[PDB]
Write a protein that binds this ligand. Structure first.
Ligand SMILES: CCC(O)(O)CCCCC[C@H](NC(=O)[C@H]1CC12CCN(C)CC2)c1nc(-c2ccc3nc(C)ccc3c2)c[nH]1
Ligand SMILES: [Ca+2]
Ligand SMILES: [Ca+2]
Ligand SMILES: [Zn+2]
Length: 368
């Protein structure tokens, strides 16, 4: 039936700025919030302002030196940290910007607070669109991510859940999360991503985990142009088999919107309905679920996507005609919620999709 949904948002999140020309735009979180408020989606959700996660909470995964660096570096003192900046990969993709640490604290706070709420059985679903920063490593920033809120949220869920399933539908491989849990069977990581001449270069079909974690990392490598039909045909069968074999007690779903058609950095062809079908599939298993954001670089489409996925979480039908909102002009020329796919060729033939699915099924047969 219909579930209780808790949503995490801090009104200051949209003011963090990565710099001119940087594709990562925290303002998309504020556009999402304003659109979902104007659709009236606040009437059915408990809205919470996340606390600022402490350096101590972040060191449950990240190194003390790395978190100390993030808490200390500022654009005005960067000159004195050239050595640490290289060591921690702070540069073009992961720049130093005003309020960087506070941005990490808010992104992380939402994810950890959502995990605590789920652990206490006070909600069925927890949503943090500011989270899902899946590339951050133990002592290194990567791919616009500095603190891995997902790993921290999973560590929190592991306090009450023996097995946690992580699913990542961002176009980029969820490498930081996969790496963090690569040698354990208490987390199964499943990533669907573009693979081949594409960041971060990891997520081959043959990367399946190591030691006690062997068979607990699942990667579905895809080519350009995947559409709703093709994605839908492999997502539900894979997730159903993973649910059957692994029997997780909690799920974390990274909803990176850069897998949508027309994304500035992505080359997939999903519509908002095709992307949201993943949320519908996961929600059907009736397990405690933490829904997170991630990529998404055509910001009007990210706001549409996450507003629709919040409506999906709430089992609320919302009209295609967009309500008036603070960013109404960004949704022209149509002013509709749903998007059309492009004429791009789907390089993922039906035979390729079935072959990769069958290889993943062989690996899933190896679970106990
Ligand atoms: C939030 C989750 C997520 O969606 O998975 C994150 C995606 C991260 C993508 C990172 C990717 N990085 C890369 O491909 C790494 C090899 C390089 C080195 C750095 N240059 C700037 C780009 C090539 C990349 N970087 C860019 C890019 C494009 C334009 C930029 N423009 C500016 C001004 C600054 C940084 C810029 C970075 C595109 N692709
Ligand atoms: Ca992914
Ligand atoms: Ca694992
Ligand atoms: Zn991405």
């Amino acid at each position: 039936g219909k579930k209780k949904v808790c949503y995490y948002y801090d009104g200051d999140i949209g003011n963090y700025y990565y710099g001119q020309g940087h594709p990562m735009k925290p303002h998309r979180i504020r556009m999402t919030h304003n659109l979902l408020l104007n659709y009236g989606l606040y009437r059915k959700m408990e809205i919470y302002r996340p606390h600022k996660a402490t350096a101590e909470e972040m060191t449950k995964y990240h190194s003390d030196e790395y978190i100390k660096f993030l808490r200390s570096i500022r654009p005005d003192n960067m000159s004195e940290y050239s050595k640490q900046m290289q060591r921690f990969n702070v540069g073009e993709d992961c720049p130093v910007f005003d309020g960087l640490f506070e941005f990490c604290q808010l992104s992380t706070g939402g994810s950890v607070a959502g995990a605590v709420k789920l652990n206490r059985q006070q909600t069925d679903m927890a949503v943090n669109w500011a989270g899902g920063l899946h590339h951050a490593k133990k002592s290194e920033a990567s791919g616009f991510c500095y603190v891995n809120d997902i790993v921290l949220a999973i560590l929190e869920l592991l306090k009450y859940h023996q097995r946690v399933l992580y699913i990542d539908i961002d176009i980029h491989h969820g490498d930081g999360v996969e790496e963090a849990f690569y040698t354990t069977d208490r987390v199964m990581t499943v990533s669907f991503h573009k693979y081949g001449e594409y960041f971060p270069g990891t997520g081959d079909l043959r990367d399946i985990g190591a030691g006690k974690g062997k068979y607990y990392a699942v990667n579905f490598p895809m080519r350009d142009g995947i559409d709703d039909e093709s994605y839908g045909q492999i997502f539900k069968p894979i997730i159903s088999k993973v649910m059957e074999m692994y029997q997780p007690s909690a799920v974390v779903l990274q909803c990176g919107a850069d897998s949508l058609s027309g994304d500035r950095l992505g080359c997939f062809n999903l519509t908002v309905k095709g992307h949201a079908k993943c949320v519908e599939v996961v929600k059907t298993f009736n397990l405690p679920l933490l829904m997170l954001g991630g990529g998404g670089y055509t910001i009007r489409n990210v706001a549409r996507c996450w507003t629709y996925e919040t409506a999906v979480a709430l089992d609320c039908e919302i009209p295609n005609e967009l309500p008036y909102n603070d960013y109404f002009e960004y949704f022209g020329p149509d002013f509709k919620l749903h998007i059309s796919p492009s004429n791009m060729t789907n390089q993922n033939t039906p035979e390729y999709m079935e072959k990769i699915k069958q290889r993943l099924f062989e690996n899933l047969r190896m679970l106990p």
